[PDB]
Design a binder for this molecule. Structure first.
Ligand SMILES: *B(O)c1ccc(/C=C/c2cccc(B(O)O)c2)c(Cl)c1
Ligand SMILES: *B(O)c1ccc(/C=C/c2cccc(B(O)O)c2)c(Cl)c1
Lengths: 115, 116, 116, 115
């Protein structure tokens, strides 16, 4: 698990369950090609998106469908989705956790990058 | 205005209006003495808490009554309040904005510190 | 001023000054068309991006160039930028403030939406 | 583990390691009595603070010594510490994770409350 995504709900104080997540890698023509996707688990987590062989250096975009998550809960959301765009850098063995904390009109995201 | 408090609502996408704020200052005997208090306005801002003369070096606690705020909107929030504790003016007088972004089970706070 | 962007620095406790901001609008062919751009001022605010006439219903993307900002301070940040994507004015014209609080490996964003 | 504390570093993108955490419970005279404490692990986590028998309903304060954490890294911090004050409510079996994401002039905290 070179790449994990974790999503939390700031309104209900819970994991954000069954949230669609799409990962894209930037191509040479500078467009976003699908790379991996899934739905978050009961623990708000999404594992097994990629493997260390496939997860090469490059720019990646993690898109979290926050709008559908809120809509299914009956709450009026602001954002179309939440997007996290970052460079994967090989300099040193790294595991990446992309965490997002969601509110209807706000979100915050952080990266936890470890050996 | 050496100390201003700004409060936003992350559920409604609006200023957080009518939020009670209490400020304390740590006294010599190490207890929290009441220093100033007020209510955020329609813009979510609380001005006029203190003056440059009164706002001396010290350790201050800004306690924002988040629970009352959420309860009136029908939500039973996690936190009793949000408190922000910091040393002020120890390198000379500064202007401090204490900003908070509120959700029922979460909040964020940041400080903007400027030199007049 | 129907659209304003405000950017704060969580490491320095200050406005984030000289941050490039690019705004796009989703066109009919579903591509992102350049809509407006600018630089945050000394107060971390970016005013004057658009007008009530120009700022029609649509899906907008506000892209904040966080990486350039951190790089100039010597920090190699995690994110390429912060992007904020939202439908605007679909219930009539509103005023939008897009606020962001920046750290090298993290950021938060919130929207304040008011009705004039 | 009825109560867990997790602390992350937003500047370095890592767990906040070896951070002192103090938990207090509010007493009848409305003063804060020490309840539990520890230092965060290598994963920025602090487990085993209490047990379900001891963790009764009441108001608790979690104090995170953020100032010492930043000082030991050579970074000038704003806050004296970060404090999280909440009511533990029995209505339903609950596990509490108090998470905090730290910057030198800012922090955010959320509660993840699950069965
Ligand atoms: B939590 O991660 C968080 C707290 C606070 C803010 C916003 C602060 C703000 C917004 C508009 C104006 C001012 B001011 O200096 O008058 C401050 C965010 Cl985005 C996130
Ligand atoms: B502030 O706006 C903020 C606070 C906390 C988080 C996420 C915390 C987290 C990350 C990974 C795992 C767990 B856990 O419950 O084991 C919690 C963010 Cl993104 C932002």
């Amino acid at each position: 698990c070179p790449l994990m995504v974790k999503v939390l709900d700031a309104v209900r104080g819970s994991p954000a369950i069954n949230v669609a997540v799409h990962v894209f890698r930037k191509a040479a023509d500078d467009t976003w090609e699908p790379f991996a996707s899934g739905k978050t688990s009961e623990s708000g987590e999404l594992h097994g998106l990629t493997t260390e062989e496939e997860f090469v250096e490059g720019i990646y975009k993690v898109e979290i469908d926050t709008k559908s998550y809120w809509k299914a809960l009956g709450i009026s959301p602001f954002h179309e989705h939440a997007e996290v765009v970052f460079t994967a850098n090989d300099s040193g063995p790294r595991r990446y956790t992309i965490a997002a904390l969601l509110s209807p009109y706000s979100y915050s995201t952080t990266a936890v990058v470890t050996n």
